[PDB]
Structure 1
């Protein structure tokens, strides 16, 4: 009959969109924030009405995607109604390193709580110090001023990732943080045991990762 919700929208989708949690979750998602198991309320909300939200967001030409690790996010399409952006290469370095720390048992004593200094030390341990520094400044040759510049850049990238939900600052401390499973996306190019050059094409075709 008329004046009846099923005329325009499914009942469960309307119930989900009328829930008190919908607005904060939608604003965060459109901002690019990933959702992990830690946000128990938001994660459960996404799980319960997961299908309604993928079909709703499809209207924006963006896929609400749940990675096998269990974290939801948004991937815009080429015809996205919501703009799209790509992380910096330094952001990739810090995200890969963050995934390593999530999987690294040596730092188990930290119990998941990490400081930016430790992250930088691990980054320089695994990466090429000076050749990575080259991107921070084209004229760097190990100068300690440029060293501090790279430290500051790493801190800034860490803050941006915090904005993306890959990392949480502690309820009182902004100098310490706890990693989230979302960081696993930084390894999507290696989660499959195949040739790297074919997986990169598969991902870029899927829209997962553009090149630089």
Structure 2
């Protein structure tokens, strides 16, 4: 009925955490460990197993895995927001950046917001939190709170984990590299985006 290795993987004690949290939109990385430490062992088996539900466990050249539902996906589809991709790219830069290695992977929402506002444009960014904003500090605080909420939602979807005693400090998954899907290759970001939407990996909101 099944290949030996696929049944082996499905029999692993970690397998239910993996399957369930991937169905719940969580994604695979250094954090989100229970869904990664053995999925490295059966990537092909889990991918062919998931194809039955018209969904694909996709690995980029990066070591992270994440779930993508087809158009005919049996498990229904949904998407994230622009600010989510933003915080995600900042988190990916943090993950790669060896300069902050001394942080040992632990990072604080203030560091995240500082890096985000440093790399990005404050006002053009803030246009999306609220359409009418014109540099009001109330909208800046709104953006900071929205960054906090997006970090929470990314925690729900396997990009970050709050420390047991600290919701202000967090550790990052390698699923963060999902956000670098338009930069994982030297091809154009737009043509790669077309290939993602073709492979249903990303869509504009």
TM-score of the alignment, normalized to the shorter chain, above 0.5: yes
Q: Which moved more, 1:170-179 or 1:9-18?
A: 9-18
Q: Can you list the C-alpha shifts for 1:143-165, whole angstroms capped at 9, x where unaligned?
A: 22222111110000001111222
Secondary structure of the 1:55 match is helix
Q: Cα–Cα, structure 1 residues 120 and 108, in superposed 2: closer, same or farther, change >3 Å?
A: same
Displacement of 1:41: 4.8
Displacement of 1:92: 0.9
Query: For residues 82 and 138 of structure 2, what CA distance do their matches in structure 1 show?
Result: 21
Q: Cα–Cα, structure 1 residues 49 and 99, in superposed 2: closer, same or farther, change >3 Å?
A: closer
Query: For residues 11 and 104 of structure 1, what CA distance do their matches in structure 2 show?
Result: 40
Query: For residues 70 and 85 of structure 1, what CA distance do their matches in structure 2 show?
Result: 23
Displacement of 1:113: 1.5
Q: Cα–Cα, structure 1 residues 152 and 41, in superposed 2: closer, same or farther, change >3 Å?
A: closer
Query: For residues 45 and 137 of structure 2, what CA distance do their matches in structure 1 show?
Result: 53
Secondary structure of the 2:167 match is coil
Quick one: which of 3, 15, 22 aligns to 1:10?
A: 3
Query: For residues 115 and 93 of structure 2, what CA distance do their matches in structure 1 show?
Result: 9
Q: Which moved more, 1:142-151 or 1:152-161?
A: 142-151
Displacement of 1:106: 4.2
Displacement of 1:195: 2.7
Displacement of 1:124: 1.1
Gaps of 5+ in 1: 1-7
Q: Which moved more, 1:76-85 or 1:49-58?
A: 49-58
Cα RMSD for the two superposed structures: 2.0
Q: Which moved more, 1:36-45 or 1:183-192?
A: 36-45
If the length of structure 1 is used for normalisation, what is the TM-score? 0.87
**Higher-Rg member (1/2):** 1
Secondary structure of the 1:44 match is coil
Residues 28 and 174 in structure 2, CA contact (< 8 A), matched pair in contact too: no
**Which residue number corresponds to residue 178 of structure 1?**
171
Displacement of 1:44: 3.3
Q: Can you list the C-alpha shifts for 1:139-192, whole angstroms capped at 9, x where unaligned?
A: 222222222111110000001111222112123211101222211121121222
